[PDB]
Amino acid sequence: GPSVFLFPPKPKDTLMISRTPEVTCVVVDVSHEDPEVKFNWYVDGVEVHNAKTKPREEQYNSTYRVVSVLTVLHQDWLNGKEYKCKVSNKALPAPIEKTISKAKGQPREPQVYTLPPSRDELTKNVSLTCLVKGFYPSDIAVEWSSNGQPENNYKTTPPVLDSDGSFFLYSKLTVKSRWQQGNFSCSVMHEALHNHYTQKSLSL
């Protein structure tokens, strides 16, 4: 029958109180010419009624795809509360249930280290590296900036599990001109950092 997918909030939304974090429940394959979907939301098993639905997308091919979005409290998500979505529709013998929560485990502070380009890489038409290692819970944010202005031409690898149970990642900012003049900052956001934010500089 239909399928149910539960997606967590973006880490940046849960790390900044200025943003709005939301968990998303998606019901797909509501085919048969008899739709309607009922959503129920639960926090640690207690029913909550503060969710926002109403973005029905037809997406033709003989299915409907309904979504429900629940605003979550930053502290509730960071404390490891479980969010449960229950989908009820006449085409299912029993309502489908899904549950999502922050990865269990003791939070670990990320260590950020900036790396300059290898000399050999200077002859080809450079890459500034940002290693973020030793953090718990794969949710993290990494950005590049210079002189207070964000840099766009960068790419970050997905978190990779290290041999000690923590995660690590690398971010590469490709760039000469500003770097030639001795001018960069890699910003990292994680739940274990002081103020959920840290910056590491890198210059000639």
Partner: protein, 332 residues
């Protein structure tokens, strides 16, 4: 006759989780192998030596289920005559309820023979027909107290149409038995003339698919035949606590059978220290359970060592009496 649609609602009972109180006191449930009774007529190497009768079980047993297998004996007429004439009056005098167990595979085969698949809309009469036929044959025929659907098939959990069939047939049964039946109006489990609807299945709630029947059954019998530790029974109940309430939950154990190959070691050895009595004494944290059940009452105290694997012997019902004492907290 009725054409009302069998809903697919619920997913959980009207009350779930540990309930510190319910109307009915804990019960001891008993599975009885009918093909080991002295009144049943079984080339069998044990054509004689059938020592135990249905009335041999202790008088404190609250409910006993007839686990009848037609392919295990030649004829059952003598057994039914003895049940109507001798067994059932004695059990009625004792106040021990009698229910009949039916396999879920048989219900699925009856659904399939009627041409029913697993859909939302599907001719509102065939499910009631199968339910009423089973009710007449298995319960009303011998004036029993209810029906115990045994669902230990993992395919039901895997396939949507099988789940639909199970939900619809259990609703049709609930129109005849259980708390949803109109015949039980103003009645509660334990009262005279109450028709029970019982569901026995795996101790894993997902494979058990208890969310399909949680709202229509009186008890859920979790086959905890390999547990025997309070931590494991607590984990099982926690797996069940969000779909059913505690007063519906009964964890059980099985006594070693002859030529079984299954090997359940919870109810072997000394009674006072066996895991079966841990199960019998276990209770949901801050709550009351439905009771305790045991499989093969005629095998009470048997093991899988020595001649026990190839010989039938009478029983003193020691495990049964101890489990009764641990469930109801009284002294026999």
């Amino acid at each position: 006759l009725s054409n009302a649609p069998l809903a697919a609602s619920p997913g959980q009972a009207d009350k779930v989780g540990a309930q510190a109180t319910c109307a009915a006191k804990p019960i001891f449930f008993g599975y009885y192998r009918t093909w080991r009774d002295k009144a049943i007529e079984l080339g069998d190497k044990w054509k004689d030596k059938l020592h135990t009768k249905l009335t041999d079980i202790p008088e404190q047993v609250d409910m006993v289920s007839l686990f009848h297998v037609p392919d295990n004996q030649k004829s059952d007429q003598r057994f039914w005559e003895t049940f109507d004439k001798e067994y059932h009056p004695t059990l009625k005098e004792r106040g021990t309820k009698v229910v009949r167990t039916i396999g879920a595979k048989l219900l699925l085969n009856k659904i399939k023979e009627k041409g029913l698949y697993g859909q939302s809309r599907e001719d509102d009469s065939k499910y009631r027909e199968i339910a009423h036929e089973v009710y007449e044959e298995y319960v009303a025929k011998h004036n029993l107290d209810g029906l115990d659907v045994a669902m230990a098939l993992r395919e039901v959990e895997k396939y949507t149409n099988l789940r639909w069939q199970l939900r619809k047939i259990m609703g049709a049964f609930s129109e005849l038995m259980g708390p949803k039946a109109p015949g039980n109006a103003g009645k509660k489990p334990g009262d005279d003339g109450y028709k029970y609807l019982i569901y026995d299945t795996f101790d894993n709630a997902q494979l058990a698919q208890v969310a399909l029947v949680a709202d229509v059954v009186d008890y859920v019998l979790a086959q905890t035949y390999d547990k025997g530790t309070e931590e494991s029974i607590t984990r099982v109940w926690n797996g069940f606590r969000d779909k059913i309430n505690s007063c519906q939950f009964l964890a059980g154990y099985a006594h070693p059978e002859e030529n079984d190959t299954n090997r359940f070691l919870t109810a072997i050895g000394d009674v006072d220290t066996s895991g079966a009595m841990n199960v019998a004494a276990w209770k949901p944290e801050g709550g009351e359970k439905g009771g305790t059940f045991a499989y093969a009452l005629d095998r009470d105290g048997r093991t899988y060592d020595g001649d026990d694997l190839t010989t039938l012997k009478p029983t003193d019902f020691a495990f049964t009496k101890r489990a009764i004492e641990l469930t109801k907290g009284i002294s026999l």
